[PDB]
Amino acid sequence: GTILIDLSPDDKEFQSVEEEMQSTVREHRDGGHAGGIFNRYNILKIQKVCNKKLWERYTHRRKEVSEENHNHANERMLFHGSPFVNAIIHKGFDERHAYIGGMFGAGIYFAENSSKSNQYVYGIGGGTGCPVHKDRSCYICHRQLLFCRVTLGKSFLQFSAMAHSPPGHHSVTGRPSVNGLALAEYVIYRGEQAYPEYLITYQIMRPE
Ligand SMILES: NS(=O)(=O)c1ccc(-c2nc3ccccc3c(=O)[nH]2)cc1
Ligand SMILES: [Zn+2]
């Protein structure tokens, strides 16, 4: 049921998605080990992901959450990187897209920093890097990330350095407590609480 619509680089919507991608790059504490060394990306393509069933699944859950939280879905646009990106855009997020070993338990993880999600494009810890060159810092191979609509509802705040949400909550927020430059990361425990809105195809760029 999924259709991918190419956005033109001239479209304001392409431009605002690219800007969120580029402007949320940060340095990582692994010095690039997982995701590679780069300060910015070469954006190759941005596509809108269109699936009626998946959208209605999302909006249905969004209303349930909203009604449990004074009519406030607390909806964000967040990045997601995964070896399962192609399955996600066709079948939606589910229990198989969960990070079992994540620090906030077995859930589906999202980041404000695009560079954080980039660490997972090739698997946990960057796996063994790109399939062609086995390089976690490959500047040649095409990578994909999702920029997703995520319903957080009432989010449990964790101050830090599939399972269930904490009772009385719809998600968990991992607030950075050491690295002053890190943005928040978020976890949901229901696949229906995220919709993979944009598929972004890119390369990381070697710093000069
Ligand atoms: N199914 S799996 O290959 O085990 C898997 C998929 C996605 C991720 C992932 N973990 C994150 C953790 C913090 C912030 C953002 C992310 C992210 O974008 N993806 C982890 C594992
Ligand atoms: Zn490569």
Curated annotation (Swiss-Prot):
Post-translational modifications: Ubiquitinated at 'Lys-48' and 'Lys-63' by RNF146 when auto-poly-ADP-ribosylated; this leads to degradation. Deubiquitinated by USP25; leading to stabilization.
Annotated transmembrane regions: none
Effect of residue 103 to V: Loss of activity
Domain of life according to the entry: Eukaryota
Tissue: Highly expressed in placenta, skeletal muscle, liver, brain, kidney, heart, thymus, spinal cord, lung, peripheral blood leukocytes, pancreas, lymph nodes, spleen, prostate, testis, ovary, small intestine, colon, mammary gland, breast and breast carcinoma, and in common-type meningioma. Highly expressed in fetal liver, heart and brain.
Residues of the PARP catalytic domain: 8-208
Localization in the cell: Cytoplasm; Golgi apparatus membrane; Nucleus; Chromosome, Telomere
Residues the entry annotates as binding Zn(2+): 130, 133, 138, 141
Biological role stated in the UniProt entry: Poly-ADP-ribosyltransferase involved in various processes such as Wnt signaling pathway, telomere length and vesicle trafficking. Acts as an activator of the Wnt signaling pathway by mediating poly-ADP-ribosylation of AXIN1 and AXIN2, 2 key components of the beta-catenin destruction complex: poly-ADP-ribosylated target proteins are recognized by RNF146, which mediates their ubiquitination and subsequent degradation. Also mediates poly-ADP-ribosylation of BLZF1 and CASC3, followed by recruitment of RNF146 and subsequent ubiquitination.
Quaternary context: Oligomerizes and associates with TNKS. Interacts with the cytoplasmic domain of LNPEP/Otase in SLC2A4/GLUT4-vesicles. Binds to the N-terminus of Grb14 and TRF1 with its ankyrin repeat region. Interacts with HIF1AN. Interacts with RNF146; this interaction leads to ubiquitination and proteasomal degradation. Interacts with NUMA1.
Protein family per UniProt: Belongs to the ARTD/PARP family.
Protein name, UniProt field: Poly [ADP-ribose] polymerase tankyrase-2
Source organism of the structure: Homo sapiens (Human)
Taxonomic lineage from the root: Eukaryota, Metazoa, Chordata, Craniata, Vertebrata
Part of the whole protein covered: 952 to 1161 of 1166
